[PDB]
Amino acid sequence: AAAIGIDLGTTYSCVGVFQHGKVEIIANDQGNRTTPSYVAFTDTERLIGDAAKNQVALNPQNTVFDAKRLIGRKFGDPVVQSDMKHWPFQVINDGDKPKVQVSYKGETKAFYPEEISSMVLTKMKEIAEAYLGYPVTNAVITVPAYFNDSQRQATKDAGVIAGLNVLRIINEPTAAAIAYGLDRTGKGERNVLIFDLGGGTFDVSILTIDDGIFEVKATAGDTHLGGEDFDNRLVNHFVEEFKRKHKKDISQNKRAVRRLRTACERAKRTLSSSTQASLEIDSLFEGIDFYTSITRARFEELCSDLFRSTLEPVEKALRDAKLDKAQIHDLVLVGGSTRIPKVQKLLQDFFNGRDLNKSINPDEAVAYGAAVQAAILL
């Protein structure tokens, strides 16, 4: 019975399995190799993953996401108080622990963050079981390197609730290094920089590896910079373009904006491989169809300040680790947003033309390494 490796992401989760000498990343019901970390409650159903994200415009108060920002924290934690103000769902205090309160099957219900995350883990477990054809019970789950003991415990608890035997909780940047075989060095210190630009967060880690032992030397980043911010820059551009062309301001209509945001996230992905993308949304606002386009160059201009800002935490991490650029042996790209060509150019230029490790889809690298580690531990 194969053990699985699970990246339980802030915005997207991913599951892999090591089998027959190789890692397979497992696609879900809709054919997608990553799954949104969303759960929604309706009058009749609990929806998890793609199905939950796909109805967020319809049902915002009862569609939960960002549980990883709450997990293992206390209600009065300044991070929780601050993050709350930008979620459409209600967070309440039950004994200084946060709970999310929703309507389900006509009743008010409340769940701890680890219960919400357990629902995402259940889906990841089910996706794996459908592919393997038998039940899976053992898993490695990853967490950010900066998670404390309470956040690690709560993550393990989420796995227990989902029916998993959690073999180990390992750090995300460590998992990514393992995916590339960087744990095998021989004697001698190797310094690895993991540049992880995901959907909601930006993490830079410098690892030193010595005889297969990992040390985290420095971490930096920004817990509120990621792909979602690039989507919002596109949204704002198109709200303005709609206002010009149709002299109407859609910004007040929450449903129109959410539908526009969905379309922008899709166009953004297209711009990683093409130089132009089309947007076609029927009946966006008061019956008006919005059919337009955007070039890669314009997208890069709209986000240029955000892209450039990713280099300051790199500089900071190097300083805290007391390392020069030349002393970094390997650069590893992690996170879906590192597929953006301008982000790759900025990092490569900053490192004076060095190669980037990017042969493993960056949004899959953490699950990949977790899967390798799971098989070892079994």
From 99, 156, 268, 296, residue interacting with ligand ADP (rule: CB under 6 A): 268
CB of 105 to ligand ADP, least distance (A): 29
CB of 61 to Na ion, least distance (A): 25
CA atoms within 13 A on the CB side of 337: 26
- Rounded Cα distance between 323 and 316, Å, is 10
**CB nearer ligand ADP, residue 125 or residue 261:** 261
The residue from 50, 66, 157, 196 that is catalytic is: 196
CB of 228 to ligand ADP, least distance (A): 6
9 binds Mg ion (CB under 5 A): yes
- Rounded Cα distance between 286 and 271, Å, is 29
The candidate with the shortest Cα–Cα distance to 259, out of 242, 245, 244, is: 242
36 binds ligand ADP (CB under 6 A): no
Binding segment toward ligand ADP, per CB under 6 A, in 22-30, 181-189, 261-269, 317-325? 261-269
Residue 268: name its binding partner from ligand ADP, Na ion, Mg ion, none (Cβ under 5 to 8 Å by kind). ligand ADP
From 98, 113, 159, 335, residue interacting with ligand ADP (rule: CB under 6 A): 335
155 binds ligand ADP (CB under 6 A): no
- Strand extents, DSSP E, 123-197: 138-143, 165-171, 190-197
Using an 8 Å Cβ cutoff, are 8 and 362 in contact? no
| Dihedral over alpha carbons 49, 51, 282, 62 (to 10 degrees) | -90
340 binds ligand ADP (CB under 6 A): yes
Structure tokens at 237: 């551009």
| Dihedral over alpha carbons 187, 193, 199, 200 (to 10 degrees) | 110
265 binds ligand ADP (CB under 6 A): yes
The residue from 66, 172, 231, 330 that is catalytic is: 172
Residue 193 sits at the vertex; the CA angle it makes with 191 and 195, to the nearest 5 degrees, is 175
CB of 306 to Mg ion, least distance (A): 18
Query: Active-site residue numbers?
Result: 7, 68, 172, 196
Residues marked as binding for ATP? 9-12, 68, 199-201, 265-272, 336-339
